[model samples]
Target: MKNVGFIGWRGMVGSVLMDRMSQENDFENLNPVFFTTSQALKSAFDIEELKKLDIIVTCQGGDYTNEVYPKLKATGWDGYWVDAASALLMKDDAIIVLDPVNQHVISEGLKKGIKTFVGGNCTVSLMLMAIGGLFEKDLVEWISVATYQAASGAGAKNMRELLSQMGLLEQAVSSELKDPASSILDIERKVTAKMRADNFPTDNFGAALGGSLIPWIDKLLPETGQTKEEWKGYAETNKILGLSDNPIPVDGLCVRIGALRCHSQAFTIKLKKDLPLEEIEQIIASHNEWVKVIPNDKEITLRELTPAKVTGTLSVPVGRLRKLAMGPEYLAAFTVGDQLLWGAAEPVRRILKQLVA
Candidate 1:
């Protein structure tokens, strides 16, 4: 590679990408140039920097991709472009990067000279990383997930706003918290009034997320009535898994929750064959280094299987696994993952290693 330009290297997702890149010392093997992005489009052309590099990895999100990608490509710069955004996902030439689940697809794409690689949607990536073995073994007929996504998925400032909202809620009940003997009803009343306050830091979220959840995550996809984020559950998952020819029905509701950075998903899987719970757990746990099969127990799950516990860690603890009452072929599994790490940044960095090597 002539040069490696890493753009959007300062934001939350980029910070995690940098950490993963640095943690593995992946940058040591490459001629890495750090970049910041949207004067980005201007800088790419005006500065004449990006066109010179044989490789570019960006965490600048879709707007940056939509703006600068084609401009650079149209210039006939045939470089390896890796992006941590969803904008170019449906582009026929762009391959979804999730090597853990789709390394074979990526290997084939490389052989076919595919140059653009985009990170899969965070929720989809997390889901595949959690339960890849079932898909690999052709055990899954279909899956539906209800996501509890962290505020950081929305934005860095949205995460801050969540904490700010939490702080305001605490400020509302500080006195009662300090004095437990105080009336519980009074604390509830004050907290309720605080939630309804006009000064609430709903700037980023546009609603209170501290003590509540937003059932929907992104804009409505007008064609199918699926939220933009929800549409990706099937689109990205099957695409990454290389199943677009005969796509397995992966449907879900993506909900935004108060967690800081990790994402938790509850899955209802329809298996083509009835398998024992132990066998399913073993299959899931053996799929990846990060996935842990937490024993389906109340106390163990309480302490080990939560976004609060998994944030900023590589561990994807899959717990609460059991057969659903609907049928023997239906399985219910819960997973908690650091969306920024395995879900968003890790693949970007790993694919970088793939390129430089």
Candidate 2:
């Protein structure tokens, strides 16, 4: 049995990874070790301890990965390294593994002695999960996407702040509603006052995300005027799809919504050639095992496609396939997925499974 070490096993992504691994019985044949970043657990990072494992899966932040991984590598610890963080993705030696999009590439890389694999950005991974079929057939010419991402993408602390803000606003509104004389404006005023109080926590997000949409994610790049999250859709998509010769042009707008989990995106794709709506739907539907094609009739209700409904599920639901009126080659659709699953943890676990096998 192979030995594996897990870092950041207590964080949101790590928790989800452990849950899926448990459900899938992925640890049945492996000897697993859990490690933490807490200073109290210094032994976890000891070189001797880490060198014992055949694989190390890190869900920790980029800074931790940046500091520790190089030291381990310098010491000649050559075991496989799979990252849930984005730190190592741009490295010359790092491989980004998206199973549905590039499983073959991963196997080939492994055969050639590549040991480092990084997970793609959450939004990028989800987009590929839903629409990778077009990319595979070279049917797509360009993509324009607007992502409605969830609080959980920012980390567990941001998620807690979002919930806290929501509760604060709800309590203020509820208190105002007790008086029959209070108007909608009165409730709004009360909630606004509560939000402006000194104790309100907006540090993680830099602004309130309870009832508002923040039209930014990751740090903005001065060169392109696009946030890192937006740029990842372009750069990482091409890399994961192995389309280095002619990269797909992806223009993205990533927004942080109030939802707790699951990410939803609206996509307008310009295809290389015009195809019938039925054909486009079939192309998308036939792409992957995890992607679910929701029919028009069944998707009429909010309950059917909302993040609340799809949270914690592996299904990446794609619907509303139609030819855009602007051009016969342009097609539009929407997708929703559990960011914690296919977007992050699940892929890491899947890669670990492959490596172990």
> CA lDDT of each candidate?
0.87, 0.86
**Candidate maximizing TM-score:** 1
For candidate 1, write residues 68-153 as lDDT tens digits: 88888888888999999888898899899988889999999999999999986588888888899899999989998899999888
TM-score of each: 0.96, 0.94
Tens-digit lDDT track for model 2 on 1-357?
Answer: 788989888888989999999999998968898887676533557878888788989897788888889888888888989999998887769789888889877878878888999986588899999998888888999999999999889888999999999998888789668878879887888888888888888999999888778999989899999999998988888888877567889987999999888899999999999888888788888988988777766536355667977899988888877788889999888989998998899889888988888
Residue 215 accuracy (lDDT) in model 2: 98
Instruction: Give the residue spans of candidate 1 off by over 4 A.
Output: 37-42, 45-47
Displacement of the residue 348 alpha carbon in candidate 2, Å: 0.2
